[PDB]
C-alpha cells in the first residue's frame, strides 16, 4: 500500500509500473528499475523544477499523488479510484500523468473521463487511445502505433523479407499493434508464415509452445514482435532454452532495454528493435545519480530499487545476506537514462503549462489559485491543454529540431522512431542506432551486425537454379516452385521458359539463344 | 454532514439508485423530496426484496440485502455515490448487481462506472436508445424499452390528427436530445415539418424557459408542441408558459408522463395535453404495502420523515424551524396516493436480478441452497450472461400470464415497447390524466374521449387556410406550407387546389363548386 503524497496548491496524480507484474497469486513482483523507478523519479524531478520556476506556475506549488500500477491494468484501475474519491486525507487531482502500458492507460482513461480529469501518457502507444469519443480526456506525448507498424513493415519490405512470422501480446497494445502491421504487410507484398500470440498470465509452457510453432516455419527466419516488455523477456528466454534462433524485429515494447535480453544475449544477437525517437534530458542524469537511500526518503520504493540494483541489503530487506557498501552509487558506469524520460518530463510540463495558462486566464489579478480556479473545469482544462504549444522543458538544447510539445486533434504526438540493432562487438552486448523512421525509412545497412554474420533470408520458397529452373507462382504471391526447363529452352524471364526454336539453342547463361553449327 | 443511505446486510447485496430527492438548485446538491418517482420507487424495491426473502422458491437459502443511495436527480452526484458500490469489491457491502438509474443521464454515467468492475445493472426506467449499445454499456440491461419506439408512437399520433406544422422542445442530454432526434426522423417520413426546434439545458433558470415560450409563440400556426424533456425541465417549461399565460397543445414523452405534480399550479396552461407513459398494470400487493407505511413503523427508510412532512405539510420534532405539528392519525391511502406509473418495472427489475442470481446459484452450488464457495466471488460477466437469457413470469404480483407478462431481454438488453396515451382532463373539477389510447406496434386511441384544449381538435399546419370565395391551395417546394391564389371571377374551384375557367356561356356559382348558364 505504498504511495507518494506531496501536498500542493494543485496536485497531479501519476502512475508508473514501479513493480513488475506479480506472478500467480501475488499482485506485484520485482522492481522495474528503468521503466519504473527512473520514470517515476523523472516526474518528481519535473515537479521539483517547475516548483523552482518563477515563470511557470509561480505562486502555485504543484503536489503529487503517485501510485504503482504493478504493470497490470486492473491493479492500475483500483489504484486510480484514489484519484476520484478525492473529488468528493484525500488529495484533489488536477490531472493524471501516467500509464506506461497501453492496457492500463486505456482502463484508467475509462475511469478518469467519468470525472472529467485530464490524463497524459508518456508512453502508451495503442492506436485505440486516439479515439476521442471513448478517451475524450486522454492525451499523450507519444505517437500511435499506426506509424510504428509502418516503420516495421517498411524495414521488412526493404530487406525483402516476404515470409515472416509474427508473435504478439494479447491486449490493446500487441493485438492492435500486430493487426496494423499485418495490414501494412499485405500492401507491401509480405506474407505471414504463422501468427502466434501469447496471453495473460501465460507460463513458460505457453511460450515454449510458441517457439516450436515458430520453428515449424524454418523458412521464416525473421520474426516480427509486438509484445509487452515482460512478455518479450519470456519469449526470448523460451528461445534460449531450446537454443532456437531467429532474427527478431520488435516494437518499442522490447525497445532498447538491455534487461530483456540479459541471460539470453546470444539468442537475441543481431536483433532489430524500434523505440520512440528521443534525446536524453541531461539535467535529469545529474538528479538521478545524486539519489541514494540516505537522501531519497520521499520515494517509498527506492530502497527496494537499491537492494535489487546492487544486490544489497541494509536492515530493510528479506532474511538474506551481504550487507551493502555505503559508498555505492548510481553513476555513469551502472546507469543509462531510459529511452522515454523525455516524454515523462514533457508530459508533466504540458500539464503544468496548461494549468498556468488557465491560472493567468481566470486569475488575472494574482499568481495564486484565486476562487474561480477553486474548482477546476476539467473539460475546459482539456481544451486549453490540447491547444498547448511550448518549447520542450529547458532540458532540451536548441529549438530548431522541432523540440516543441503540442498535440494532434486526437491528442497524440509526432511519430518519430529510431531503429536499433543488438550488438556485442566489444565483448559486451549493447544497442546501436542503425537508422530511423521519420515519414520514410532510413538506415545505413553497413553498420548492422546480423545474426550468423549474414543478412538474413526470409522467403517462402527457395531461389531457383539459374541454369534452368523458372519461377512458378501457385495460388498465393509469396510461395513458388522451380521448374527446370527443356535443354532447348531459355528463360525469356524469371518466370517463363521458351523454346529457342529450330536451328537455335539457349545460351550458356540462358538469357538468349544462339545459332547451331553443322 | 449527514448523507443518508439504506444498508441492509445479506448473503448477496443489491445496490439501488433512486432520485429520492429533486435536483438541488444553485449551490445545494439535493432539493425537495420526489414523492412519487422517488420514495414510491424506493419502497417498491424494499417491497420486492422483502417478498423475495419470504419466497421459498426463489433464492431460498440466500438472503438478499441492499445498499440504496439517492441520486438527487443528477448524474454527477449519482456517479459519486456509485463509487460506493465499487470500493466494496476491494463496513463496505459487496454488490452483486445494481438496480437503478431513473433518469437516462444517471444510468448512462453509472453504467460507465459499473462496467469497469463487471457489475451488472438493471434500470427500471431509463429509456435512452444509447443504452442499447452493448459495446459501451456491456453490463446494462433495463426492464423498459428504448425511445426509438416512443418517438414513433408520438409521430404517429401527430400524423393521425394531421398535425404537420409542429414545434419541438427537448432537454439537453442523452434523454431529450436523442429522443427528439428520433422523433424528427420519424416526423420527416410521415411528412411533418418542424416550426422551431427549441432545447433547454443544464441549470437553466426561469429566463431560459421564458426565452423558449417566446420563440414558441413566434410560430403561431404551430399550435402543437412536441416535448421530450426531463421531468423537472417539463415542470419549468409549463411554469414559464403559465406566467405569460401562453397556451399550446402539448404532446410530451414519459419524461412528463402522467405526473400530476408537473402540472400543479398551472393546470389550465396544460389542459388537454397529451402525454405518453410506459404501458404497465399496477401491482396491487404493493398498494397494500405502501399504504401501511408510516413514520412509526418505517424507520429503515431515512428519507421517509422528510417525505411525510412534505406530502402532508407536516412537522413533528424532525423538521425545520416551522409550525403546525402533525396529526398522528394521518396515513397514506386511496384518497391521497396513487401507484406511480413505473413501479411494476422496479419490481420486475429487482426480480430479474434475483432470478439471475438464483439460476446461477443452482448451477454452481448443486448441493445446497446456500452461497457455496463457488459463488463466494461472483463472476459478473457470467452473471450478465445468465441474466440476459432470463425469462420468467412477472413477480406473482401480476394476474394471468396471457397478456405476455413474462420478463426477458433483447439481445441489447431492452424490454418490450408498449405505451399508453394520456389526456390531461379536469371534467370533475379536479385535474387528472385519462388513458385515451395506446401504442403496441400500431397506434390506437378512441378519439371521442379526448378533451382537447379550447374544446376543438387542434389545427397545426404551416400556412393559413384559403378564403373560400376564390383562393386555391398551392404547394410550393415542401408539403407543409402553401399559398392561397384567388381565382379569376370567371373560374370556379374544381377542387381545393385547382381553378378552372367555366368556359363560355357559363359563370361560377357564388359557392364556386360549379358553373351555371348565363342569361341574356
Ligand atoms: C531485394 O532486396 C535487395 C536487398 O535490399 C535489393 O538489393 C533488391 O533490389 C530487392 N529486389 C526486389 C525484389 O525488389
Ligand atoms: C387527416 O387528413 C386526411 C386527408 O385530408 C383526412 O381524410 C382525415 O380525415 C384527417 N384525419 C383527421 C381525423 O384529422
Ligand atoms: N508503447 C508501450 C505501450 O503502449 O504499452 C510499449 C512499451 C511501453 C513502455 O515504454 O514501457 C509503452
Ligand atoms: N424514461 C425516463 C428517462 O429515460 O429519463 C423518462 C422519465 C424517467 C422517470 O420515469 O423517472 C425515466
From Swiss-Prot, chain B:
GO terms for biological process: cellular response to stress; G protein-coupled glutamate receptor signaling pathway; gene expression; modulation of chemical synaptic transmission; postsynaptic modulation of chemical synaptic transmission; regulation of synaptic transmission, glutamatergic; sensory perception of pain. Keywords: Cell membrane, Disulfide bond, G-protein coupled receptor, Glycoprotein, Membrane, Receptor, Signal, Transducer, Transmembrane, Transmembrane helix. This is Metabotropic glutamate receptor 3. Glycans are attached at residues 162, 245, 367, 392. Belongs to the G-protein coupled receptor 3 family. The chain holds residues 28 to 567 of 879 of the full protein. GO terms for molecular function: calcium channel regulator activity; group II metabotropic glutamate receptor activity; scaffold protein binding. It is a multi-pass membrane protein. Its main location: membrane. It is found in: Cell membrane. The keyword Membrane applies. L-glutamate binds at residues 41, 104, 125-127, 175, 254, 342. Disulfide bonds join 30-72, 193-480, 314-326, 365-372, 462-481, 466-484, 487-499, 502-515. GO terms for cellular component: astrocyte projection; axon; dendritic spine; glutamatergic synapse; neuron projection; plasma membrane; postsynaptic density; postsynaptic membrane. Residues 1-520 are extracellular.
